[PDB]
Amino acid sequence: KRVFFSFHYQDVIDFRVNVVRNHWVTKLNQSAAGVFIALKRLINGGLNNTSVTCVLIGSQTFNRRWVRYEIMKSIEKGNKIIGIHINAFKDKYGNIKSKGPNPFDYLGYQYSSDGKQLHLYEWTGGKWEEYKDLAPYRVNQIAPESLRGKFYSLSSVYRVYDWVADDGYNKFSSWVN
């Protein structure tokens, strides 16, 4: 499978992102996409010809505008989506850090009462607000009453791993498959 990696730029600079990305692309010789209305177009193109989105979670990832977009756009496109904490191993400065917030806790959705549309929300610091960088969209899929008119945080939907705790060295390819 072709994997879209989503991340804070600072985690690229600190050689945290490359630990996971190099495992997939070099060690396992697979292929990745990633970015480090125009910028959305670029990201959309990156997400095209991928089937899995992998959010690499560092200290500030939860707060990044285009990480949020990459996640929301990934849902609309029907990508598999997972998160992986990347703070538990040493960065290029030789430091280990505590886990950052789960980006999925800061994003959410609600199905419309007729079940035909999906409304999108993000946490803006003191409240939930309608998400502005991606429009609500039509779901062509069945939407049972038990799913309608209820708010869900994305952390109730997508799975999060830790590279060290969950042994990504042995298990990453299973997480995206």
Numbering used by the authors: 3 to 38, 52 to 192
Copy the relevant paper text.
The Thoeris system is composed of two genes, thsA and thsB. In the present study, we report structural and functional analyses of the ThsA and ThsB proteins from the B. cereus Thoeris defense system. Crystal structures of ThsA and ThsB were determined to resolutions of 2.5 and 1.8 Å, respectively. Combined with previous findings, these results advance our understanding of the molecular mechanism underlying the Thoeris defense system and suggest that NAD+ degradation is a previously unknown strategy for bacterial antiphage resistance.
To gain structural insight into the role of ThsB in the Thoeris defense system, we determined the crystal structure of B. cereus ThsB. Two ThsB molecules were found in the asymmetric unit, and the RMSD value of the Cα atoms was only 0.9 Å, indicating high similarity. A five-stranded parallel β-sheet (β2–β1–β3–β4–β10) and five α-helices comprise the Rossmann-like fold, with α1, α2, and α5 on the concave side of the β-sheet and α3 and α4 on the convex side. However, excluding the additional antiparallel β-sheet, the Rossmann-like fold portion of ThsB revealed a structural resemblance to TIR domain proteins such as human sterile alpha and TIR motif containing 1 (SARM1), nucleoside monophosphate hydrolases, and toll-like receptors. Despite the high structural similarity to SARM1, ThsB did not cleave NAD+ in our in vitro assay. By contrast, our SEC-MALS analysis indicated that ThsB exists as a monomer even at high concentrations (~1 mM). These observations suggest that ThsB does not form a stable complex with ThsA. On this basis, we tested the hydrolase activity of ThsB in the presence of various ribonucleotides such as AMP, GMP, UMP, and CMP, but no hydrolysis was detected.
